[PDB]
Amino acid sequence: RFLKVKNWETDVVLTDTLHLKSTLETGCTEHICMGSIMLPVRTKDQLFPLAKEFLDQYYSSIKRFGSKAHMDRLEEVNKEIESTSTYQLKDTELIYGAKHAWRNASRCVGRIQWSKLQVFDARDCTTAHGMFNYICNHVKYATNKGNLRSAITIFPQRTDGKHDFRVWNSQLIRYAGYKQPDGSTLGDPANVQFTEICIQQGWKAPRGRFDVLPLLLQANGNDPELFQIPPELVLEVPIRHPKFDWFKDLGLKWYGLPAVSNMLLEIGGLEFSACPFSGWYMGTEIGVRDYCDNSRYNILEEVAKKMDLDMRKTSSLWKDQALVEINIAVLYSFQSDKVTIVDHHSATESFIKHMENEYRCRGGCPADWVWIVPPMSGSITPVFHQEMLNYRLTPSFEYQPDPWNTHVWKG
Amino acid sequence: RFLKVKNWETDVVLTDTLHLKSTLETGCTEHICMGSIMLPTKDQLFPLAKEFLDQYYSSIKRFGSKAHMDRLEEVNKEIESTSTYQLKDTELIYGAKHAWRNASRCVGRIQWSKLQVFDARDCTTAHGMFNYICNHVKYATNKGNLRSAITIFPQRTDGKHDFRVWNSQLIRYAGYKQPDGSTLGDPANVQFTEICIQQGWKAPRGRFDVLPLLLQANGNDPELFQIPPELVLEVPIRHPKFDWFKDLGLKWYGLPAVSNMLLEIGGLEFSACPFSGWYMGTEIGVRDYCDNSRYNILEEVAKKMDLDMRKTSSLWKDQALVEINIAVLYSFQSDKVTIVDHHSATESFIKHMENEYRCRGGCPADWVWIVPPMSGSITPVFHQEMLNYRLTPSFEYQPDPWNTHVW
Numbered sequence: 001r002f003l004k005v006k007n008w009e010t011d012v013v014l015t016d017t018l019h020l021k022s023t024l025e026t027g028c029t030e031h032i033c034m035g036s037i038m039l040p041v042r043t044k045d046q047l048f049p050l051a052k053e054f055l056d057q058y059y060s061s062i063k064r065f066g067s068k069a070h071m072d073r074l075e076e077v078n079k080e081i082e083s084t085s086t087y088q089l090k091d092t093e094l095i096y097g098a099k100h101a102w103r104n105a106s107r108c109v110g111r112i113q114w115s116k117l118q119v120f121d122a123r124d125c126t127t128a129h130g131m132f133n134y135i136c137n138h139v140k141y142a143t144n145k146g147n148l149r150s151a152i153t154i155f156p157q158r159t160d161g162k163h164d165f166r167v168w169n170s171q172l173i174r175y176a177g178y179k180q181p182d183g184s185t186l187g188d189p190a191n192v193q194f195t196e197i198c199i200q201q202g203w204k205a206p207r208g209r210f211d212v213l214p215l216l217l218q219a220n221g222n223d224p225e226l227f228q229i230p231p232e233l234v235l236e237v238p239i240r241h242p243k244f245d246w247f248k249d250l251g252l253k254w255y256g257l258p259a260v261s262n263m264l265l266e267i268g269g270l271e272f273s274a275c276p277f278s279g280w281y282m283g284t285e286i287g288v289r290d291y292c293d294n295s296r297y298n299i300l301e302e303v304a305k306k307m308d309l310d311m312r313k314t315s316s317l318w319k320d321q322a323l324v325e326i327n328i329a330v331l332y333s334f335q336s337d338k339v340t341i342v343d344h345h346s347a348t349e350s351f352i353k354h355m356e357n358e359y360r361c362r363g364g365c366p367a368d369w370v371w372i373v374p375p376m377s378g379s380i381t382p383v384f385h386q387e388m389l390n391y392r393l394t395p396s397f398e399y400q401p402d403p404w405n406t407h408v409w410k411g
Numbered sequence: 412r413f414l415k416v417k418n419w420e421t422d423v424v425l426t427d428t429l430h431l432k433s434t435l436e437t438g439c440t441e442h443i444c445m446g447s448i449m450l451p452t453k454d455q456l457f458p459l460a461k462e463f464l465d466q467y468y469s470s471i472k473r474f475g476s477k478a479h480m481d482r483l484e485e486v487n488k489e490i491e492s493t494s495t496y497q498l499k500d501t502e503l504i505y506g507a508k509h510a511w512r513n514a515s516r517c518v519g520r521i522q523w524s525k526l527q528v529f530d531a532r533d534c535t536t537a538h539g540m541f542n543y544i545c546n547h548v549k550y551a552t553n554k555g556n557l558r559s560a561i562t563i564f565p566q567r568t569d570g571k572h573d574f575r576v577w578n579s580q581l582i583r584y585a586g587y588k589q590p591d592g593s594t595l596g597d598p599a600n601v602q603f604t605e606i607c608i609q610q611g612w613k614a615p616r617g618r619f620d621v622l623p624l625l626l627q628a629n630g631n632d633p634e635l636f637q638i639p640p641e642l643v644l645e646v647p648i649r650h651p652k653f654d655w656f657k658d659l660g661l662k663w664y665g666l667p668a669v670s671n672m673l674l675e676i677g678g679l680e681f682s683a684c685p686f687s688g689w690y691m692g693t694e695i696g697v698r699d700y701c702d703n704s705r706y707n708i709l710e711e712v713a714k715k716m717d718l719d720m721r722k723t724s725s726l727w728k729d730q731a732l733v734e735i736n737i738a739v740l741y742s743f744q745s746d747k748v749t750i751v752d753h754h755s756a757t758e759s760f761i762k763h764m765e766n767e768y769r770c771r772g773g774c775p776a777d778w779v780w781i782v783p784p785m786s787g788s789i790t791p792v793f794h795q796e797m798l799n800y801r802l803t804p805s806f807e808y809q810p811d812p813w814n815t816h817v818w
């Protein structure tokens with residue numbers, strides 16, 4: 001079966017054959033679309049086909065499909081599953097797997113860079129302290145004094161689901177949020193629950209507007225431990241505006257390194273519950289969502305006040321006007337300190353080319369339009385006008401429940 | 412089977428039960444989501460009439476009444492005899508308001524119940540059609556105080572006798588392909604603009620020439636008519652701070668009036684059902700003016716603002732986009748023509764969603780279309796999970812007549 005997508009700006013039509021290789025569900029049916037819904041211990045039984053599938057993919061990519069090296073590996077894995085109920089990936093397989101999980105990530109606009117991913121194998125790690133070490137090294141390597149490099153660190157895979165490695169932080173670097181008795185919030189409202197946990201686990205909170213959270217690390221199913229990332233390894237960028245001198249006085253800054261640490265990495269049916277990954281920011285992530293979401297820092301009014309916009313009627317577009325200047329400020333700041341960042345025009349245009357190249361060479365590119373289109377200026381980016389097919393391929397990054405909700409406390 | 416939707420900005424969760432009444436298909440499967448794709452007999456007829464009459468009679472709190480049962484047999488008799496049936500005025504009106512109510516892609520649906528319905532099923536000719544349409548335009552325009560309306564022409568019979576309005580909207584600017592290779596006027600209408608000329612229209616070959624109506628009655632050949640200019644309300648576009656802005660020579664019409672869709676009610680098909688409301692500002696300023704394949708004026712506005720257009724990262728496109736949209740709202744409000752900004756309209760839609768969930772068990776909605784094409788996440792609909800499904804009565808797409816019509 002062939003499926004066609006059309007770009008309604010360029011009339012370019014592409015044909016997808018890759019969806020045929022799609023396994024997992026979407027959440028949609030013939031009678032209902034769930035494309036705007038945010039969130040849509042394995043047996044030896046189901047494990048081997050999943051291993052076989054992966055290994056088949058792997059050996060095809062290296063052009064050794066049906067070789068003795070291929071067959072022997074299948075046999076080898078088959079036996080290891082029957083006698084041990086699981087198996088270990090070769091380094092080459094782990095690297096291929098991690099890159100392809102990124103490549104298959106349909107909500108990610110930045111996938112043109114997928115083949116350039118630095119894979120840190122942390123499968124020999126045994127303790128929280130060991131995790132801290134790996135993570136520090138990840139952060140130093142990725143930051144690279146401002147010239148950012150994509151990386152992922154992979155901790156040991158799930159066994160019986162009782163010895164999980166987990167990073168409790170949603171991101172490696174993130175600002176604390178504090179609920180005040182008056183109901184207002186100090187810092188990042190999105191991190192209030194996590195900050196409270198850290199505090200309870202013994203973290204002495206400085207209680208400012210931008211306190212870098214501590215790492216809360218769980219190894220081998222044990223209770224999580226607190227570590228503070230060395231400040232010298234956390235690159236931050238004070239935000240200022242190229243024309244507005246008062247902007248610096250808002251007191252804003254942000255960190256340079258976006259690093260997601262709460263996702264699950266599935267490769268060949270194996271589950272890696274601790275796999276922090278990092279790249280670089282698209283400007284709007286900070287300047288639109290982080291600064292301007294009503295439930296985040298929420299700086300639109302204060303910025304608009306200073307620009308002296310007509311804030312009486314929404315139809316003055318004072319919110320839209322302030323949003324653009326804030327986003328201009330974020331980009332100007334990062335560029336000025338030579339910390340890697342990409343604007344949403346540049347990023348979306350690159351994704352279009354990547355997507356086109358993925359149709360030619362791969363037969364498709366699964367993409368989630370709802371997430372790909374930037375949260376400001378949507379239709380002046382080429383992705384707005386691009387029809388996309390969303391379906392799920394493995395290897396993949398998956399969601400997983402927050403550890404504080406599932407963890408068995410030891411004491 | 413009882414689905415929930417969350418607003419991630421307010422934590423409000425709503426439970427959807429209405430989707431269970433859905434009958435038509437979405438185009439998605441368990442394996443692939445097509446949510447971003449633009450375009451996915453007597454025995455057929457009677458269940459459709461039934462489903463429709465059941466909901467109609469339920470809406471008037473007379474489910475399982477003699478009148479209900481009586482009407483059901485009456486329509487059954489008529490289908491079994493005529494191979495079709497006629498809607499009572501009351502059903503027709505209910506039908507139309509519900510097609511709008513059910514339009515999952517429409518952000519302006521909070522007003523759905525105040526639709527003025529013009530019954531034009533007695534129409535037999537294109538001059539006839541023209542007369543109905545002029546009346547519609549005048550009534551809906553209301554000297555700038557816009558009122559929603561629909562005019563309904565006779566239902567399809569054998570597909571040989573279709574009424575069609577060939578225009579996509581009642582009022583649209585013409586578009587011409589100059590020998591330069593460039594495009595003068597609206598590029599979206601180049602092909603239809605040729606068909607007008609091919610059928611006899613004399614273009615003023617300008618930039619904002621109001622297209623002529625091309626009307627088809629009983630499957631006959633379509634005819635041209637020029638709407639009385641005095642009935643087409645337009646808004647010169649100026650900026651409340653940029654005095655130079657008016658020299659760009661931009662204007663826009665006040666009445667958005669979609670004329671090419673198909674209205675399906677109780678199995679019956681109305682291929683000519685022009686309807687109209689009032690603009691949300693971004694349709695004009697973001698899409699019409701700044702789409703690359705439309706008037707595409709970003710670069711020239713940017714020049715006039717003397718913005719640093721060297722790098723994409725100065726966000727000069729974004730900056731101009733805001734100003735252009737500021738101007739659109741300003742000009743319409745200044746001339747007292749109804750318009751709504753994307754903040755007000757999306758906040759209204761959220762309130763409507765809440766009303767629909769609490770009073771109907773849900774509200775079908777297409778996030779891809781509801782989220783305005785600028786400043787998406789600073790409007791509340793961005794953070795609102797929505798379920799998309801197909802309810803009837805409905806507005807559907809239908810093929811362009813020129814590809815179909817047998818002369």
Ligand code: HEM
Pocket residue numbers: 098102105107108109110111113117150151152277278279280281282285342347371397
């Ligand atoms: C290098 C530059 C990168 C850019 C500019 C980028 C951009 C983005 C953006 C803007 C999102 C939307 C998330 C949000 O708005 O909350 C996203 C999602 C995502 N990204 Fe990327 N990313 C980059 C690197 C990476 C890397 C290195 C990985 C994995 C190895 C990755 C995997 C993902 C995944 C799995 C999602 C899905 C999130 C979800 O499902 O909720 N990205 N990306």
Ligand code: HEM
Pocket residue numbers: 511514516517518519520522526559560561686687688689690691694751756780806
């Ligand atoms: C009164 C103020 C109204 C507003 C502000 C409004 C707004 C909108 C907008 C912005 C869209 C997106 C379409 C696009 O971007 O091209 C839309 C779609 C739509 N509207 Fe409304 N509308 C209004 C009245 C009406 C009325 C009176 C009807 C029918 C009687 C209607 C039926 C529809 C339908 C069927 C669609 C989707 C068409 C499709 O499937 O592509 N609207 N509306």
Ligand SMILES: CNCCN(C)c1cccc(CCc2cc(C)cc(N)n2)c1
Pocket residue numbers: 110258259260263277278279280281282285
């Ligand atoms: C509900 N929010 C999603 C949080 N998650 C799971 C998530 C996943 C991937 C990406 C993001 C946005 C942060 C980010 C991460 C990376 C590696 C790059 C980038 N530009 N942004 C967030």
Ligand SMILES: CNCCN(C)c1cccc(CCc2cc(C)cc(N)n2)c1
Pocket residue numbers: 519667668669672686687688689690691694
């Ligand atoms: C891209 N979609 C095709 C154009 N169609 C079929 C379509 C249908 C309904 C609405 C629109 C947008 C124009 C419009 C119409 C009405 C009544 C109100 C309004 N504010 N805008 C367009």
Ligand SMILES: C[C@H](O)[C@H](O)[C@H]1CNc2nc(N)[nH]c(=O)c2N1
Pocket residue numbers: 008384385386387388447448449779780781
């Ligand atoms: C590819 C994508 O489906 C297409 O660009 C859609 C996106 N959302 C839209 N939303 C609205 N309101 N109007 C449109 O024309 C479109 N176009």
Ligand SMILES: C[C@H](O)[C@H](O)[C@H]1CNc2nc(N)[nH]c(=O)c2N1
Pocket residue numbers: 035036037038370371372419793794795796797
């Ligand atoms: C309800 C809706 O799906 C939700 O708000 C989505 C919309 N699109 C998004 N797009 C990005 N990049 N990030 C997001 O968190 C979201 N959130």
Ligand SMILES: [Zn+2]
Pocket residue numbers: 028032033034035439440443444445446
């Ligand atoms: Zn879908």
